[PDB]
Amino acid sequence: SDKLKEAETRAEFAERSVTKLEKSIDDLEDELYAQKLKYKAISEELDHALNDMTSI
Amino acid sequence: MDAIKKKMQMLKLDKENALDRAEQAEADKKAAEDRSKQLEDELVSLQKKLKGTEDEL
């Protein structure tokens, strides 16, 4: 019974670590996706300005 | 990127060239009305002589 309690404690520790890392990954994931959205926006717009060079 | 920089330069230079061209064209305009006015002057004088010549003839 004592060994079962120790193993259960360690398993619960690991599982809480799992959940916390998953939440951190979620936050990072959202930030990276928004970053790339605005990156592609600014890149397209620099290209549009270059198109302006073509129109000139 | 850098091309847009060249753009700043070429667009400004072309704008200043256009400004100078407009100023020179206006100056030549004014000079041309000056010459038109002087030509009118001698034409009027010679016509005023011509009238009396017509009468005496």
Side-chain angles (χ1 to χ4, degrees), chain A residues 5-35:
Chain A
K5 178 56 67 179
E6 64 185 337
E8 157 197 349
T9 291
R10 291 188 170 96
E12 292 296 328
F13 182 76
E15 282 209 48
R16 304 281 70 72
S17 291
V18 172
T19 54
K20 288 197 286 294
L21 306 168
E22 281 187 307
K23 178 57 163 93
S24 83
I25 297 171
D26 186 12
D27 305 347
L28 290 172
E29 280 159 322
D30 278 357
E31 286 289 295
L32 173 56
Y33 186 38
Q35 182 63 356

Side-chain angles (χ1 to χ4, degrees), chain B residues 10-50:
Chain B
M10 59 88 69
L11 188 60
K12 292 187 304 292
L13 296 169
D14 296 346
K15 167 67 185 298
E16 306 183 8
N17 176 243
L19 280 169
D20 294 335
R21 186 178 186 266
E23 291 146 18
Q24 196 269 338
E26 290 176 14
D28 296 327
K29 193 256 190 189
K30 181 61 183 70
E33 289 91 10
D34 278 334
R35 72 203 57 175
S36 311
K37 187 166 69 68
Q38 59 88 10
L39 296 170
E40 179 182 3
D41 200 309
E42 71 266 12
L43 172 68
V44 170
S45 65
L46 211 62
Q47 173 64 230
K48 294 303 172 69
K49 287 180 69 67
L50 174 67

